[PDB]
Amino acid sequence: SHMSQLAHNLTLSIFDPVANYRAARIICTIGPSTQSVEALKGLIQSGMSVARMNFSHGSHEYHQTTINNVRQAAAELGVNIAIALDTKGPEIRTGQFVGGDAVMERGATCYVTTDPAFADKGTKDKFYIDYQNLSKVVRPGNYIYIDDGILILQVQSHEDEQTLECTVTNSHTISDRRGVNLPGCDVDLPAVSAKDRVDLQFGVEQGVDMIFASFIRSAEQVGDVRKALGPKGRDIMIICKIENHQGVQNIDSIIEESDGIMVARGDLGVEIPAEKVVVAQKILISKCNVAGKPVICATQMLESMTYNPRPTRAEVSDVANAVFNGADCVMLSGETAKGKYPNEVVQYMARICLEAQSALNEYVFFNSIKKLQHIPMSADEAVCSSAVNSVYETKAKAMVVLSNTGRSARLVAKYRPNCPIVCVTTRLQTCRQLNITQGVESVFFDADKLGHDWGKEHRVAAGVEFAKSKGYVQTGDYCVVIHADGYANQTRILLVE
Amino acid sequence: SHMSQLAHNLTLSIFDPVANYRAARIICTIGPSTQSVEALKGLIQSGMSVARMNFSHGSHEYHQTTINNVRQAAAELGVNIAIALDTKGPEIRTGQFVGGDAVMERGATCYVTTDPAFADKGTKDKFYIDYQNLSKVVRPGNYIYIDDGILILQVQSHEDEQTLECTVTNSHTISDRRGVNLPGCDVDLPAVSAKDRVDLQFGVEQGVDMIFASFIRSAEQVGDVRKALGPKGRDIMIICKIENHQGVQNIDSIIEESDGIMVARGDLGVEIPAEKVVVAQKILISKCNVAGKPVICATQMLESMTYNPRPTRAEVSDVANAVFNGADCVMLSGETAKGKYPNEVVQYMARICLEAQSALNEYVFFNSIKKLQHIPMSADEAVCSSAVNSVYETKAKAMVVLSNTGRSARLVAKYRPNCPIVCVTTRLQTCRQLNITQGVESVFFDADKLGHDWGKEHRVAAGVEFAKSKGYVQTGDYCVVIHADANQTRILLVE
Amino acid sequence: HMSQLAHNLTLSIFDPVANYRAARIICTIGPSTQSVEALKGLIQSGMSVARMNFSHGSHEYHQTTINNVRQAAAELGVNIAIALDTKGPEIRTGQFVGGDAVMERGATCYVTTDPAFADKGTKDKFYIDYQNLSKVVRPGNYIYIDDGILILQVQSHEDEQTLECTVTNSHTISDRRGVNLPGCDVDLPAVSAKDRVDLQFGVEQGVDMIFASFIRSAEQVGDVRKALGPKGRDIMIICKIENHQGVQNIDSIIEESDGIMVARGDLGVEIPAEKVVVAQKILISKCNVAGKPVICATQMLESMTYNPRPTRAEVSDVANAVFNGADCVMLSGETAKGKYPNEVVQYMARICLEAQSALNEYVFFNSIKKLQHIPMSADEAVCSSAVNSVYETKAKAMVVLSNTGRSARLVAKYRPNCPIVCVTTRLQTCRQLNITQGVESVFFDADKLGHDWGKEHRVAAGVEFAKSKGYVQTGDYCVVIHADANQTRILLVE
Amino acid sequence: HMSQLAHNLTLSIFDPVANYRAARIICTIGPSTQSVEALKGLIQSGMSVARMNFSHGSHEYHQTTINNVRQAAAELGVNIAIALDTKGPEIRTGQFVGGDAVMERGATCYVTTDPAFADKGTKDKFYIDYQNLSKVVRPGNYIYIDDGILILQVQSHEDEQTLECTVTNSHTISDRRGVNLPGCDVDLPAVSAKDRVDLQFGVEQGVDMIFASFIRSAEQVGDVRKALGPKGRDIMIICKIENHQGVQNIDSIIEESDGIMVARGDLGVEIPAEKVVVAQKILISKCNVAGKPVICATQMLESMTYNPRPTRAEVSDVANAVFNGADCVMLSGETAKGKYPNEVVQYMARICLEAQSALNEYVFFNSIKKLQHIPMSADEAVCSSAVNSVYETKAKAMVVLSNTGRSARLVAKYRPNCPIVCVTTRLQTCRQLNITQGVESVFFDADKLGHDWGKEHRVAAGVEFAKSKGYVQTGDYCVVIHADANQTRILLVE
Secondary structure, three states: OOOOHHHHHOOOOOOOOOOOOOOOEEEEEOOOOOOOHHHHHHHHHHOEEEEEEEOOOOOHHHHHHHHHHHHHHHHHHOOOOEEEEEOOOOOOEEOOOOOOOOOOOOOOEEEEEOOHHHOOOOOOOEEEEOOOOOOOOOOEOEEEEEOOOOEEEEEEEEEEOOEEEEEEOOOOOOOOOOEEEOOOOOOOOOOOOHHHHHHHHHHHHOOOOEEEEOOOOOHHHHHHHHHHHOHHHOOOEEEEEEOOHHHHHOHHHHHHOOOEEEEOHHHHHHHOOHHHHHHHHHHHHHHHHHHOOOEEEOOOOOHHHHOOOOOOHHHHHHHHHHHHHOOOEEEEOHHHHOOOOHHHHHHHHHHHHHHHHHHOOHHHHHHHHHOOOOOOOOHHHHHHHHHHHHHHHHOOOOEEEEOOOOHHHHHHHOOOOOOOEEEEEOOHHHHHHOOOOOOEEEEEOOOOOOOOOOOOHHHHHHHHHHHHHHOOOOOOOEEEEEEOOOOOOEEEEEEOO | OOOOHHHHHHHOOOOOOOOOOOOOEEEEEOOOOOOOHHHHHHHHHHOOOEEEEEOOOOOHHHHHHHHHHHHHHHHHHOOOOEEEEEOOOOOOEEOOOOOOEOOEOOOOEEEEEOOHHHOOOOOOOEEEEOOHHHOOOOOEOEEEEEOOOOEEEEEEEEOOOOEEEEEEOOOEOOEOOOEEEOOOOOOOOOOOOHHHHHHHHHHHHHOOOEEEEOOOOOHHHHHHHHHHHOHHHOOOEEEEEEOOHHHHHOHHHHHOOOOEEEEOHHHHHHHOOHHHHHHHHHHHHHHHHHHOOOEEEOOOOOHHHHOOOOOOHHHHHHHHHHHHHOOOEEEEOHHHHOOOOHHHHHHHHHHHHHHHHOOOOHHHHHHHHHOOOOOOOOHHHHHHHHHHHHHHHHOOOOEEEEOOOOHHHHHHHHOOOOOOEEEEEOOHHHHHHHHHOOOEEEEEOOOOOOOOOOOOHHHHHHHHHHHHHHOOOOOOOEEEEEEOOOOEEEEEEOO | OOOHHHHHOOOOOOOOOOOOOOOEEEEEOOHHHOOHHHHHHHHHHOOOEEEEEOOOOOHHHHHHHHHHHHHHHHHOOOOOEEEEEOOOOOOEEOOEOOOOOOOOOOOEEEEEOOHHHOOOEOOOEEEEOOOOOOOOOOEOEEEEEOOOOEEEEEEEEEEOOEEEEEEOOOOOOOOOOEEEOOOOOOOOOOOOHHHHHHHHHHHHHOOOEEEEOOOOOHHHHHHHHHHHOHHHOOOEEEEEEOOHHHHOOHHHHHOOOOEEEEOHHHHOOOOOHHHHHHHHHHHHHHHHHHOOOEEEOOOOOHHHHOOOOOOHHHHHHHHHHHHHOOOEEEEOHHHHOOOOHHHHHHHHHHHHHHHHOOOOOHHHHHHHHOOOOOOOOHHHHHHHHHHHHHHHHOOOEEEEEOOOOHHHHHHHHOOOOOOEEEEEOOHHHHHHHHHOOOEEEEEOOOOOOOOOOOOHHHHHHHHHHHHHOOOOOOOOEEEEEEOOOOEEEEEEOO | OOOHHHHHHHOOOOOOOOOOOOOEEEEEOOOOOOOHHHHHHHHHHOEEEEEEEOOOOOHHHHHHHHHHHHHHHHHOOOOOEEEEEOOOOOOEEOOEOOOOOOOOOOOEEEEEOOHHHOOOEOOOEEEEOOHHHHHOOOOOOEEEEOOOOEEEEEEEEEEOOEEEEEEOOOOOOOOOOEEEOOOOOOOOOOOOHHHHHHHHHHHHHOOOEEEEOOOOOHHHHHHHHHHHOHHHOOOEEEEEEOOHHHHHOHHHHHOOOOEEEEOHHHHHHHOOHHHHHHHHHHHHHHHHHHOOOEEEOOOOOHHHHOOOOOOHHHHHHHHHHHHHOOOEEEEOHHHHOOOOHHHHHHHHHHHHHHHHOOOOHHHHHHHHHOOOOOOOOHHHHHHHHHHHHHHHOOOOEEEEEOOOOHHHHHHHOOOOOOOEEEEEOOHHHHHHHHHOOOEEEEEOOOOOOOOOOOOHHHHHHHHHHHHHOOOOOOOOEEEEEEOOOOEEEEEEOO
């Protein structure tokens, strides 16, 4: 019997043809070294499906350019690249430093103020932290984690109402404006602060496709986001970023009430042990798989390619095992944001994603997933899992989903067929929005030009002809056609003509 | 965990409402006590779906009458009753006896002859056997089996070219013209005798729906029967009767080449031990479910109700278990042909079938069958097996299968959904012909009167309405629609 | 190879029968089989359990059965269990003038509780032994005489002891027949004062098990136990399920008793016959998962009471009782008053052997396995993991050392595809194991052949039996198990 | 609840870590961990195997490694395995004047086989030790240098010993680096004269296992056993899979060797990085199914050679080596020339502990069982059934009496959710089990504490170890097993 992965690894051979449709999706973070149309085209061409604007930095005019360029680059290449707005959030940062940085030393005693006068002239003996309620929330004995939690200062006493005496436990030199975390204090900051509310309204007007919501801990907080986007942005997706343990603990309620998860390894790892982050990843990705919402593998992906032409052995296994975990998206930050090799990172990630995938036990995923759905299931759920089951039964070589919001294509993608899925939509912003779901590819069908398509056949042909041109289907091959969402519900098996 | 029948048994309570819609189908043998339109109406009304005509008896005129009445009775009630023409076959029989019977006592010597002169005036001391090359095929020491093999004669020598000296081993008294079996001789008779060919042509002209071909041993003999049916009957269903051990052996090549099987326990029992025949049944019924072609639990069904008002505690278990094995159909012979209780026999069998069926693990069938299909499967095969899988996932209280030849209805029927299957046909014969396939009902759709229906949605509506008015589905209930040959599945939210 | 259906495709009727019947046969003793010569025949035809029906005959009569069975079995060097089937809360009609009655339909008739009318009853007025009948019966209620194929309907009280009754179903009735009262409180004690003495008789005579009649409560079993005394703590209690009051309770009744008997006939009194079949499946599958013995009970090979061969259906009935999962099949009238007691059993052997050797053995082991609460008790794991070892090695026999039978019964629970050979110091264990399928019991006399502190001697005797019955040869594998402490060997039969 | 996906849904990181590390850690001893003081520290941090890399250093040197490992583990009263990793058919470049070369791009450079260039090479012409190099290479061929990251193209033969080469890739290369020749029959024998001598030294010093290099062929393993000779028959042969010829022949190789090491580094030379990941899965799962130890091998925690903390990716990579199914993880240079040798092992242990205590155990047990041929031999079944018992009973530890250690190794194969405690009279079994996951050895001296014929003393010692490690308590169940015969017990720990 060919039950589960172990059984499957025994057949696999690396010398066999790399089965060619890359399911996994790549997000890049745009920044100084990739903002230009020209360099964006390269990103698209290397394998980007999502541009990620990071609102922790840059004016609106900045991001506005990133928005205009992405659109133009994409239009020139004739593809659809989803734009994502990534929330600043309830961030806590240190001030700047005189000279480059600090040089925090071990034995050292140092001072930390919430006095803004020390922002523009920070020093390694005393520096700024922008969290105004710092000295009203911290006791002596507590630690302040700085710079990805790699620098730890214990708090010793209150120098003044605004300044903190601090011992320096760890030691390492640190750059301008770094990530501060206060374990064991209620950080009162709201998940959608004054700035975010205006950042998110900017995103709605500009027609972003999704939000990457930073530091979500509450099921209730995802609510504050939805509300701040307003009804004029009821259709924009909310992809919650899990960054702290409060978020892991509340993953279920957060998933039940969101559109997807980004598993932010870097941040979790600030106060979660690095080895436990590995498990955390597995748990998060799989909860998402089961729920059928998109999940993104987060930070420190191919980290060495920010400054080197070739990634390290380990970095590679990290990407591969991310796919194996069951990731929809892998993502790059600095590597493409400020990196010295923006095309090469994306290309190489694409290759690793392609490989890993073609070695996965595609089936088990489906079977495992089916076995966990509550029966009796909703028509459209059954409609999809049966279609996927049909793919497997017939060895069908492509699926054509006619989907208009994405619901269907996303709920099919849930059941992991061993073939490419081709989504055909009259909504362009669906094409974009399906760039975070694995294995789906979107073919736009223009209802303004090519008619209303009542008989629904014109759109199905459009899907097959695409599938045909991509190499998925040849005259003879089978093809599972599905439509879900009183009509709705419908599946054909087509003989590709 | 709930994997198989044992698990399922622990939850069942006999006191629970009996899931209505008897899946199994009933075949009756028409004869003197059921030929009247009047009696046939009661038979139909009692639970009959298939009227079997046994051509081992009666002129064409007799069966013309059977057909005419079966038809008119059914037409009057507004139902579709399939007519089976049961082949005579390669039958060996004895002649007649002076007075009712024989009276074979034990160590007695008797003479068996192939001389037709003795056919009308036979005796316990010497009588006729119609198979002409009897003497030319039998060695001394062979047993001659008579009357469902309950009387065994041993052959001692040839008295002349036409007569055999026989010793009597079993003692029983025997009626006129009983079945004769010769174990261990080449019974050279054709599987389609010259008489069979005319009977079969008579079948094609009167528009029978199927042949119940007796004594099939070959892959190739099923051919012989089709070639005899001619091209004007290219559509008539051949059901192969498995009646002997040469038959069980070749069951596989036979199934692969026929439209269905009848497990004739009585005839298998002539020279296979009863206990073995039980297992034979089990094999043949499962071999047919996986093959997806009909199977009929054949003989001696509810036997004592030929002449008693109520059947025996055993006869019932025997029926219950027939449905449990996975039979499509249950057939009566003597009970309805000559029977003193033709209605009550069908009603009781109706009731037993409903009960057993409603206590069977429907799912374990589906899955067990799904996991025995060689992948990759042909589109419609998958389309159906997944359409069923859709049912179990949604607890859909009905299915609507639009099928023209019955192929699709039959292929869904194979995967045992736990609900009524409602077929819609634009061919009337498909309605009759589906009466041997389990848990399916047919709604006819007159493409002549009600339009040719392109969008195939007028037809669905009808299939749904039926289901709605049979009690199967209401507003809110889910319903699975399927058409194959092509390929299309909907899940309807019945309004 | 998941399920039976899949397995059925591979079977062939022309393949040799695997020689070892696993199901066990119980025969009821009566006039035609009480003699040592008749019992010898019965044993050799394949009887495993002498059933004494205490509804009929004195102790002296039953004493004779007990003495004669013992003497028969001994002469053949075999061990035969002895069941004391209980009378219980029976209601019977009185006697009749001339053979029977002949109840015709539209007839009005009279049913008394007055004892005077016992030995001289007619079809116009006849006795019923239930004293409180008239006090528990509203007019309109049906009375069910004779396995409930004669249905009276009550019309009024002619007096305190007599009921006016209209006759519904018309069929003639013999002497003294089973009366049943649907929808009344039959106040009859499960263990009655006459039953008390009966049970104690069995305790003194060393019967091996009781077939307690008409069990309705988990508690009623208690009544049987409390009456067997502390001197009969070892006697097995098999509950007979004879009514819907006991089908509904089957669950708690299994959890308390030592095993079930599925009395199809007496269930069939008011439960429609078709359902009885399903009830049969449920009870057997329930006992099976519980790992306690279950007997398919009445109306078995019913025509072989007067005929030399059974009816087609009477065969399927037996065959299906084995597939259903039963440990035992029973014969009542067929062996008790039958004309062909030997031939009756000899078919039942043959049918059992046939059914049993076509029955997918694995699907059982797996089905029961996948229904046990985890974590399971050591002894439980021990056996299942041994039966697992059996399938993994294709081991051709098992050897269980059990002193009470517990271990053997827990091995037999998980259905290996081979014989189980039990080895015991207790003789009563040999007998007691005659109702659990797939086991054969070898006596090992701790008295004459030493105590066996190594267990190595009893095991040689296990294998040696196995080897002799043609189960295992030099080369074969034998799974050796001892539970309760908790040990399992896989032997390479020398 | 079927597979990892289902199990992942339950898991939470805040559920306390299970306190037993199954994964085993091998360290390559080098110039920074050869002292007893340093070896104590390694062991204490979690090293189970000292690897002697014979590509470098004299016999004298490794003699020192052998003596110290011995003495350190004796002082700490622990049993520590000594592995001899073989040089094999290595192709290496000579030394360079200055530190190294600095290969700039499209520049012509020369390659000699002429020894007189070995000690004084330049970036313009340098030595390579393979003699038939120029007899075996065509113009148009590639010479790979330094684990792949420098590619030369052969242009023409300057002379019988010198190749003209264009430099394709630009990176500088240190002293004596590895040379590879793709699409050339590298003829060198798998066990060379120098290796033959090396192995005999191994045998004489009582190494416990060989880490044989560049194993391409099922019958090259044969050559290693021939060189080890009859005096070293009981030394294990762990074949290193290092080239693609070995990934193809893994099947024939595994079934013929004792175990597999997965040398990502050298596999990575001509096999694209992302494929190696897959080859790792394939090689690991293959061994698990075969029941032989597999070791994840190169570039493990690579940055901790120079840094006090690993990277995020390095951690993932270790973790996944456990999820993939490795028995062992190895550190090469990190403990050899490392600057944080203890901390390297410490961090590694910790990772392996985390990964494993979230690694669905039961799926391994089934994945493997459902892949063994039936009918399996008694000891196979005795072991699988034992584990099945472990699961049915939620037993908290196992105890194997195994002398050569076959049975322990063959139990570990089925992956119980408890620690395995192996008990042995043979000291060398204790060390040799240092490479199978989730097993610990207790040495039972047959010379001081009697022979123990009834095995009862040895089981006590089994359970006591268990007890003192906080695995089993007065109350918990413990599965005892001895195979090769074939006996399983479930003990209620006293």
